[PDB]
Design a protein around this ligand. Sequence first.
Ligand SMILES: CCCCCCCCCCCCCCCC(=O)OC[C@H](COP(=O)(O)OCCN)OC(=O)CCCCCCCCCCCCCCC
Length: 185
Amino acid sequence: TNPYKLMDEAAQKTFDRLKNEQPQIRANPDYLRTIVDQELLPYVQVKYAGALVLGQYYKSATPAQREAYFAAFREYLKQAYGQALAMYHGQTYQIAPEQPLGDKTIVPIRVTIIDPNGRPPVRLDFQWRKNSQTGNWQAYDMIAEGVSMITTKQNEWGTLLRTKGIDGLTAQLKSISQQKITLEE
Ligand SMILES: CCCCCCCCCCCCCCCC(=O)OC[C@H](COP(=O)(O)OCCN)OC(=O)CCCCCCCCCCCCCCC
């Protein structure tokens, strides 16, 4: 279980479904949520990325609040990444070539989304951590062009956390995950 292979398998499998399952996506755009759930989330440290988004506000949550938060957060990943896969129009991808890992516990792995018409590339640095029990590698952030998504969400949900706490943020996640995914034509 090595992050460069996993990064590449996740990518291969996602692109395959996006190319070959247009009928399913067009019959029901929320079917993108499946492609995210089956091809991308198995490699995502969903609790850890959820907890990082909470920061200070993790310590204060009851187990009940945390489990309701994480459930909401996974639904919210499927919806949000689903809505991003709605931007597919026959892009291809490139992976950073494998480095040796040595003793490193964090590794950034770039996937360049490549436009078929030679429009500008999108550089996504996926952040992989070695799990400290199992040794397995999982993604826990995405740096889109220069910017951490996790930091982007800390900043954007910070008032909602100061005003309404985890419960407020869990209500907003559930709310967004109920938005039907929309397709460009
Ligand atoms: C590896 C396979 C990659 C798939 C790419 C397929 C190509 C399809 C074409 C579309 C181009 C892709 C880039 C879209 C532009 C963009 O980055 O934005 C896509 C959007 C940002 O946009 P927004 O303003 O809607 O944010 C507002 C949306 N709420 O991020 C998101 O979902 C944000 C969600 C991130 C939440 C916290 C971060 C958790 C990190 C966990 C890591 C998960 C994946 C790990 C997998 C191993």
